[PDB]
Amino acid sequence: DRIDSVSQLQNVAETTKVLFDVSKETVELESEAFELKQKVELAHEAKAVLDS
Amino acid sequence: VSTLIPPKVVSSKNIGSAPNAKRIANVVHFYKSLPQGPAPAIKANTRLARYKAKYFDGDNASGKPLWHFALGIIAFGYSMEYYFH
Amino acid sequence: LQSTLDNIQSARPFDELTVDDLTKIKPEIDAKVEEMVKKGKWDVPGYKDRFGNLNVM
Numbered sequence A: 001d002r003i004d005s006v007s008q009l010q011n012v013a014e015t016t017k018v019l020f021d022v023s024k025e026t027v028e029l030e031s032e033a034f035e036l037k038q039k040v041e042l043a044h045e046a047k048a049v050l051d052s
Numbered sequence B: 001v002s003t004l005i006p007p008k009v010v011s012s013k014n015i016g017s018a019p020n021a022k023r024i025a026n027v028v029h030f031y032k033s034l035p036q037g038p039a040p041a042i043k044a045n046t047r048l049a050r051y052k053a054k055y056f057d058g059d060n061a062s063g064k065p066l067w068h069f070a071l072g073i074i075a076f077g078y079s080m081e082y083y084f085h
Numbered sequence C: 001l002q003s004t005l006d007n008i009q010s011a012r013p014f015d016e017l018t019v020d021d022l023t024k025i026k027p028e029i030d031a032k033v034e035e036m037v038k039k040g041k042w043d044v045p046g047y048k049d050r051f052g053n054l055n056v057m
Helices: A002-008 A012-027 A032-051 B018-026 B049-054 B064-075 B077-081 C002-009 C019-025 C027-038
Strands: none
Touching (some): A002 B018, C019 C027
């Protein structure tokens, strides 16, 4: 039974490193379009005033 | 708030689980155990070694030794009950 | 643990193991018998479950 328990995570821990790696960027890489959000909302009011 | 990391924390987790207590038990129970009936000491040589190999071994384990004991009394007819009380 | 499996498959003295060898393999087996007598736990349970008492009729 302990053969299976050890073999459950024989391949997991090293494959979780790239998992832990990429998950960090994919979470904390949302700032570039956050600034684009600032200019996208800047565009809407620019359209809004001229439409007004 | 961030990426949690409980995939790799068994280096200190493999001590408190119940199977680990059995794990450290039976592995010690295995290494020194004799492989294939080695060191059985089948050649018994102590005083009446011949008796140790015919009936005293236990393969027969029957009434022959008491039959031998009874015959010894029969052979002692003129030593205990005759010529004496 | 794989070596343990290879260890157990060809090292099974289920018919020729020595209890004194069990004393050698674990001093606890030796240790647990002395204080058993001194403390007064003369009766030993846990036998009739596996082997019957083998009472004559």
